[PDB]
Design a protein around this ligand. Structure first.
Ligand code: UND
Ligand code: UND
Ligand code: K
Ligand code: K
Ligand code: K
Ligand code: K
Ligand code: K
Lengths: 252, 252
């Protein structure tokens, strides 16, 4: 019966993500179309309006252009559902790249509530997904039980596995998928993504003329999601070695 | 003797923050001065160079302007130490606004290592700071011991305390300090900050002509740091109520 509990948690979470991905999609998308216009309109009017404008005339155009940039809309789509799903997930995993921020007040507010509920929901979700994976991946230090040393080797080995399997493999996959991204950049991106730092200087699936982008988003959303679980799995496996519980306990 | 262990942890952490705040300050600052120039130079040359330039001539200037924006440098200082300290802390608390991202490869790489070491160090730091605060703030459900109900009331009461004390009070303080920020925006900022989501659409201490800014940074760095501890404190207090351990346990 415990299997249908975790099985439902996993289901409901995914839905909560689609739910939000939809609510965000709709409320925030409209303000974008209208903002896309105010920019395309202010773009045309600037060039055609005052060809040789002065220092005071440029700071006024650039201002309105940069302001649009900070909100995810560049003068040169953010809230579809494939991308709004991307946002909803990175907001509950708490990465927050920012390449897409809510624009209205409803979005901003819905985001807040959606999170108060989702963030926690997300912990529970992860806790379960990890407790389980942790055991199946760390039930083997026993098939080996000397005892303490089977773990210190299981850990360091498991680290070198996922570090490669989740950073280097995708660090390369992105060096591929994303043009302007070299390896370091792709790798660097993975680190700040799976760490949930999310500076947002780099975000995949945002290149001029990207084909099948809809999926790339859904793929990323999963890369990030799984990679996080993987980290936590590796974290538990490390946080549970004798020497660590020792070092930790040393401060309470 | 346990008091000098946590006391040193708290010390060393703070230093690790200053250490990084310095290393980042120096390596990344230079690329900024040089980038500030390439922009001030491309700014002058654009207006004076081709007053009435066409559609093809604007996309080329705006491109280089927006590209600078995404990296923290606007055409219209990011790595001093008061602000570099701000970065180092938000990177280890994992908020990552992005208003400041490392520019060189050294910065990007140092950041990664600094984090692999700091993030953990930061957990330990928090764990201690919270375990302690948790007990002194939740040793009182006992001074009240019926028993289970003294906690469900201690929790809900403590929530309403810090929610007000860390969100509303500062939500207002910012409505003050930050011009363009109304209450919702200030409050909204606090939520995504203390949640460590850090979209970065709003970052305090970044207004044209901000006086005593150096401190405002150091103040924020602390607001964020403490507010996080506060959250975790409140989180533990909630994660440890019978009904919850019950609901949680329901999935392993
Ligand atoms: C919700 C907190 C997630 C923390 C992730 C920490 C990953 C650290 C990896 C360091 C090698
Ligand atoms: C390093 C993980 C920090 C998680 C902070 C969660 C705060 C949630 C507040 C919800 C009211
Ligand atoms: K973050
Ligand atoms: K960000
Ligand atoms: K972020
Ligand atoms: K940003
Ligand atoms: K985070």
């Amino acid at each position: 019966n415990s299997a249908t509990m975790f099985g439902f948690l996993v289901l409901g979470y995914l839905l909560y993500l689609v739910f939000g991905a939809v609510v965000f999609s709709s409320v925030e998308l409209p303000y974008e179309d209208l903002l896309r216009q105010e920019l395309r309109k202010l773009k045309r009017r600037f060039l055609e309006e005052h060809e040789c404008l002065s220092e005071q005339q440029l700071e006024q155009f650039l201002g309105r252009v940069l302001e649009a940039s900070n909100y995810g809309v560049s003068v040169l789509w953010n809230w579809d559902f494939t991308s709004a799903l991307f946002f909803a997930s990175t907001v509950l995993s708490t990465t927050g790249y920012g390449h897409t921020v809510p624009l209205s007040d409803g979005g901003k507010a819905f985001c807040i509530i959606y999170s108060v509920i989702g963030i926690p929901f997300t912990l529970l979700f992860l806790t379960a997904v990890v407790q389980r994976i942790t055991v199946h991946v760390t039930r083997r230090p026993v098939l080996y039980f000397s005892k303490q040393v089977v773990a210190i080797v299981h850990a360091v080995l498991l680290g070198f596995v996922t570090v490669s399997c989740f950073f280097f493999i995708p660090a390369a996959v992105f060096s591929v998928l994303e043009d302007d991204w070299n390896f370091l950049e792709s790798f660097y991106f993975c680190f700040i993504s799976l760490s949930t730092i999310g500076l947002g200087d780099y975000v995949p699936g945002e290149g001029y003329n990207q084909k099948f982008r809809e999926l790339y988003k859904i793929g990323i959303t999963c890369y990030l999601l799984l990679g996080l679980i993987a980290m936590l799995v590796v974290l538990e496996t490390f946080c549970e070695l004798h020497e660590l519980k020792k070092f930790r306990k040393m401060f309470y």
